[PDB]
Amino acid sequence: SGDLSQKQALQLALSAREHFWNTMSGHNPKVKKAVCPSGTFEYQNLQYVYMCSDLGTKAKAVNYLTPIFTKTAIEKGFKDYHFTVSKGKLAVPIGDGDNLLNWKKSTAKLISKKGSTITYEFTVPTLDGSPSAKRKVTFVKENKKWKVNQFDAVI
């Protein structure tokens, strides 16, 4: 209830990872038969591609992220990663990433409880055997749920 266990924190972190990756990627793979508009445009000296239809509008993306990220985290995430709306469609800049952090095999150490927030430090083994990564994740109670307070806390 008023607590979040190590086990629960990892399950929430894995959901945040999937939502961040899918939103940056423009598509939730489990929504089948979505259509993905092709074509690019330039905006703010960045090259953009369109979200697929399942995340095709800001409203669709907000609803996708609401269960796992706080309201502030969602708004700041759109800003930090330069999402834009063009011709009524949500769009994201091109770019690259990798998934070297093996979050599913991580361990979580409690660091802090303050107010309605709990902070865990995760020790995350890597796919290439580089030193296990330290990643802090802060969870905030919002609308009766524990939610991650940074869009990019789990990558």
């Binding site: 940056m24 000296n45 990663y81 330069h82 091109i94 770019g95 580089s130 990564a133």
Partner: protein, 134 residues
């Protein structure tokens, strides 16, 4: 401070000081802060040394595989771009340093030097190499 040695020098200067910026490295703010993704890091290091690998806002792994001249893995040289299969074909890129290591930016520890014979990177490498300075 130019060419292959300049790109490697500039790129190596932020090892351990440059956490990965997912999908980033193309805004003026990211460039100011010297934070990048794998491809915008490579583009920045070579551009700092006077080598044009593409426009800032449009350069990704997808476009870097089309730059320079294809060379075989057996003839790869210090300064060549090496590509790796991670979540997709040619999803990661680094700069070969010679002697079996490569300079790259990846999420685990940001800008870093890794080994081509690291079992993960050895399996990820399929032989795709691009020579960008002759």
């Amino acid at each position: 401070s130019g060419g292959i040695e300049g790109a490697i020098s500039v790129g190596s200067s932020i090892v351990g000081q440059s956490p990965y910026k997912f999908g980033g490295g193309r805004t003026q703010s990211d460039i100011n802060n010297r934070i990048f993704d794998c491809s915008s890091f490579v583009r920045w290091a070579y551009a700092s040394a006077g080598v044009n690998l593409g426009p800032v806002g449009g350069t990704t792994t997808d476009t870097l595989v089309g730059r320079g001249q294809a060379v075989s893995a057996s003839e790869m040289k210090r300064g060549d771009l090496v590509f790796f299969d991670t979540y997709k074909t040619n999803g990661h890129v680094g700069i070969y340093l010679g002697n079996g290591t490569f300079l790259n930016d990846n999420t685990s520890h940001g800008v870093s030097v890794d080994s081509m014979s690291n079992p993960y990177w050895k399996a990820a490498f399929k032989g795709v190499v691009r020579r960008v300075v002759q």
